[PDB]
């Protein structure tokens, strides 16, 4: 498969078996084609579809509210907002791109993967429509920055913590490599998206917000580099991917994993089991890319000898029994998120206990959740 | 006497008295509240018709919301029919603007009407009136007097009345409209239109199939149904019906829901059992605010089966002290601050100084903008 943000091994196996006419896969792909129809008809979304504008006055600037910040009832204007870790302020849904970036990302991802497997031009054409409108359109496309992502009313300093929102559209950016060579994705479309991705990569690496997020001591730094790798892989910068793995990702794992394999930065969160898992999901998506060029982030040690497999080891019994978790978790943990994580970690590590547990937890055969498309093996 | 309505009339009268006498503590408190209220004077009045997606009637004046715990079924091609996940609010609810707009309207009308009652300044009646007219009686912007499409569920075949509980967000504003009667801005015509609207809503809640079913609910929905019923009846000055509902429906319903140890078994089975135990009692609390103004104390009056609502407070009191001690399912954190007004209301109605003391110890923030706390200087 082309370099991108997916399990390349599972995708190739699906395309092989679908082209071979294998019955199990052909039936699974035909279900996925029924799921995917809503995306062929779906009107492409745009970040410009908001009423309340950013401080730049530019509807093309992405802006969201940082989810745990709330009006202060003891202030006349509610300002400045105050933090309630783990309590999502429903005001976030007043920023349309919060859910629209997810909807776009789901649509482009599903369509791009279904085009790669089946070769049907109708999937590239619709995938292309979503990509053009979201990224490159001179009126509807988003500016390549995350300046106003997770803004906070009344906050005086700028932060880069909102960059983590980018994972919702950076996976779709990656899957665009899958429609290159279709009739619908012209050389001109590719150049524009290449140029947008080049400007976004530049902003990520050189803006102050980008630099600060690249140095975050918790799961934000890990997601920053996972996003970084999707952009770099889209741009075919294989040397930079190696450099990011060795100079940023591995040192981060070495610092954030304690000797017992816990992630202390996530243990202090009110949703500590969710955020431990979310840290590892960043590594999981990062590894999907690094493992396509021979770097296994699950088993490759940092300079201090720590390996991401130690973090999985620490959490595994709590994926078996979340009720055993001893740290603060003020909402129930969704065990299903462990399925893909334990499958990904298990195959990379040769740990059949992890792979077995992934299949016992399982994914629903008929689920329309787009990230589960490659994982027939769990269905 | 304050007009009959959905508030602690004793505290409101105390506030108006002291404010008019010029007592310093109250005058300063009311001047804070006037600063808080300023946003409501400037606020553009909201309307249920400010939606894009219409209800099956095709009428924008029909209130419509999504039942909050119903989610798309990802294993279905269309996500239909939705499935229930108790206690997990589907953010799709925020796609129905009247869900939050009913709250915002309710807050503004409540705050402004109470501030007019306390202070006598016409500017509060005038703004309160603007919000009431637009929400209720306006021939284009006012809501139709029904809750047919409240908490609808995609793909569900049966009609339900469970969405009626949404009405509490605007039924308190309806009640407070009595406080601006006699202002210059609230004309005789305004009163008649709202009287007529309230009559039609009372007819709908009592005679529609959805209203009848909700009136028979065996959990907190039945309690809130009667609390809402009382707000409407008190607005309409139907004191004989208030007595009848208190004696023939609320007290038997309340007695039926209290187990021998004072627990509320219907609420213990919920994923948010401490929230819904508290929510059941808040219904009784607001109902008692109306019944006690005509001599019926719902906290201390036993039902005919011998249960009394004070038993339910007794069961929950130690867990209001220490919410972490709660042993039943509570998949989100419980807000202890909700115990403050509840224990003060029950504590005063019962002469229980331990409840009142704890209420003041938990307390409310002196400067909070939460409009339901306006009468509770005593806790601030
Ligand atoms: O978008 C979502 O709704 C949600 O996103 C994922 O969780 C994210 C949040 O979006 C958000 O960015 C949050 O950031 C936290 C975090 O703790 C962050 O490191 C930083 O912490 C600050 C904070 O001010 C503290 O008080 C302390 O001083 O440390 C600071 C620091 O610099 O470390 O900011 C806060 C915050 O603003 O709340 O957590 C994110 C995360 O940790 O990834 C995720 O839950 C996802 O499922 C969901 O989609
Ligand atoms: O509006 C909110 O977001 C929220 O409202 C308050 O909680 C309300 C909910 O809005 C909702 O109506 C919910 O109804 C429950 C309840 O359990 C009810 O009895 C009924 O239950 C049905 C259901 O079919 C079950 O599957 C079972 O068969 O029992 C049935 C029964 O009739 O007993 O409907 C469900 C449901 O639709 O989810 O709970 C309400 C309540 O208990 O008052 C409240 O949380 C408030 O703070 C908040 O504003």
UniProtKB/TrEMBL annotation, chain B:
<dbReference type="Pfam" id="PF05426">
    <property type="entry name" value="Alginate_lyase"/>
</dbReference>
<keyword id="KW-0456">Lyase</keyword>
<dbReference type="GO" id="GO:0016829">
    <property type="term" value="F:lyase activity"/>
</dbReference>
<protein>
    <submittedName>
        <fullName>Alginate lyase family protein</fullName>
    </submittedName>
</protein>
<keyword id="KW-0732">Signal</keyword>
<feature type="domain" description="Alginate lyase">
    <location>
        <begin position="47"/>
        <end position="326"/>
    </location>
</feature>
<dbReference type="InterPro" id="IPR008929">
    <property type="entry name" value="Chondroitin_lyas"/>
</dbReference>
<dbReference type="InterPro" id="IPR008397">
    <property type="entry name" value="Alginate_lyase_dom"/>
</dbReference>
<dbReference type="GO" id="GO:0042597">
    <property type="term" value="C:periplasmic space"/>
</dbReference>
């Amino acid at each position: 498969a082309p370099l991108g943000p997916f399990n390349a091994t599972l995708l190739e196996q699906l395309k092989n078996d679908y082209q071979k006419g294998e019955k199990e896969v052909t039936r699974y792909i035909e279900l996925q084609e029924k799921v995917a129809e809503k995306y062929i008809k779906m009107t492409p979304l745009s970040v410009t579809a908001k009423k309340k504008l950013p401080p730049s006055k530019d509807p093309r600037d992405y802006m969201t509210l940082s989810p745990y910040w709330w009006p202060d009832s003891t202030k006349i204007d509610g300002l400045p907002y105050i933090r309630k870790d783990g309590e999502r302020n429903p005001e976030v849904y007043e920023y349309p791109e919060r859910e629209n970036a997810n909807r776009f990302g789901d649509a482009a991802y599903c369509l791009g993967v279904l085009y790669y497997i089946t070769g049907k031009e109708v999937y590239a054409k619709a995938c292309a429509n979503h990509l053009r409108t979201w990224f490159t359109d001179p009126k509807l496309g988003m500016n390549p920055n995350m300046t106003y992502a997770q803004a906070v009313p009344g906050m005086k300093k700028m932060r880069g913590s909102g960059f983590i929102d980018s994972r919702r559209f950076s996976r779709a950016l990656g899957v665009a490599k899958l429609i290159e060579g279709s009739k619908s994705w012209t050389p001109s479309d590719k150049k524009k998206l290449d140029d947008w991705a080049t400007a976004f990569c530049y902003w990520m690496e050189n803006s102050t917000q980008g630099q600060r997020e690249s140095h975050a001591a918790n799961n934000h730094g890990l997601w920053y580099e996972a996003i970084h790798l999707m952009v770099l892989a889209y741009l075919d910068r294989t040397d930079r991917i190696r450099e990011v793995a060795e100079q940023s990702i591995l040192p981060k794992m070495g610092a954030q994993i304690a000797d017992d394999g816990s992630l202390p930065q996530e243990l202090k969160r009110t949703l500590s089991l969710h955020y431990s898992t979310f840290a590892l999901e960043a590594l999981m998506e990062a590894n999907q890319i690094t493992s396509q060029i021979g770097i296994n982030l699950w088993s490759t040690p940092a300079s201090n000898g720590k390996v991401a497999s130690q973090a999985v080891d620490y959490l595994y019994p709590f994926y078996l029994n979340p009720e055993d978790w001893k740290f603060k978790q003020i909402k129930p943990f969704d065990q299903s998120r462990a399925a893909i994580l334990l499958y990904e970690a298990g195959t990379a590590l040769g740990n059949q206990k992890y792979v077995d547990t992934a299949k016992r937890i399982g994914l629903k055969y008929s689920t329309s959740d787009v990230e589960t498309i490659p994982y027939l093996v769990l269905k």
